[PDB]
Paper text:
Bmlp6 crystallized in space group P21. The crystal structure of 1.8 Å resolution shows five copies of a two-domain molecule with a typical 30-kDa LP fold. The C-terminal domain (CTD) of Bmlp6 (residues 92–245) is folded as a ricin-type β-trefoil lectin-like domain. The interactions between the monomers in the crystal lattice are weak with no indication of possible quaternary structure, as established by the PISA server. Specifically, molecules of MES, isopropanol and fragments of PEG were mainly located at the protein surface. There are only two potential cavities in Bmlp6, denoted Po.1 and Po.2, in contrast to Bmlp3 and Bmlp7, where three cavities (No. 1–3) are present. The structure demonstrates that Bmlp6 differs from Bmlp3 and Bmlp7 in the conformation of loops, the electrostatic surface potential, and potential binding cavities.
For example, there are significant differences in the annotations and even in the sequences of particular proteins. This is especially true of 30-kDa lipoproteins (30-kDa LPs), the most abundant group of proteins found in the hemolymph of the silkworm fifth instar larvae. The 30-kDa LPs are involved in many physiological processes in the silkworm body. They transport lipids in the hemolymph, tryptophan metabolites and pigments in diapause silkworm eggs, are involved in an immune response pathway in an antifungal defense system, serve as the source of nutrients during pupation and adult development, and are the second major yolk protein component. Bmlp6, as a 30-kDa LP member, has a fold characteristic of this protein family, classified as Lipoprotein_11 family (Pfam: PF03260).
Author numbering: 8 to 245
Write the structure that this text describes.
Amino acid sequence: DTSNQDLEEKLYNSILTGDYDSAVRQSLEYESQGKGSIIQNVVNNLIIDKRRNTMEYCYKLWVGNGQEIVRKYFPLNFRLIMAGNYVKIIYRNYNLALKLGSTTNPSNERIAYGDGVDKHTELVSWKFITLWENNRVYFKIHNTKYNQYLKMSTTTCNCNSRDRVVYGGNSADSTREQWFFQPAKYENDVLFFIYNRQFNDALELGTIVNASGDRKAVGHDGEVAGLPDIYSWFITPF
């Protein structure tokens, strides 16, 4: 009886309010009834609205018998993220792939960069590991070559004068070693803003550091969601 439009509204509301168990139940029911278009429409609208809760919805489907729904109705990159596939993480603005540098500091940590050239070797391979906590999905961003996790400094102050350099470290148990994503649609692509769980700073590429055109990776100070052309990332298969 209830129209597909009204069910879309109910589903969107569930997701926005963080009632993921209702969202998953609804989604399974709609797909079983051949009304999967409801899910497609909600995913489209969530992304147009740049809702971070899209990630949670995807995750909860992924672990809640909804893997086929994820495959069918979300862009490919969502499955790459939830399935833990090897990926490249490429900055939209400069088209540079994320890597870690070759030297370690006394804390045994590497500095993160966008590579000026490389889009192919193991140097730019990553995978994501999910963590569900506080009714939210977070990501540990794991570097294949060096077996380290993307992070911000775990020794710096929790204050406005913090170190904003992005590093790689051996573990990912701290909120500073964890990240959350916000999707956005720009031109034909679904891209992601990637934010540090503890600091809320968006992952950004700053100034050029060498002749090959590498750029430093840093945490941005301020809102970025209006500018996916400047501050978002592509996630593509490695």
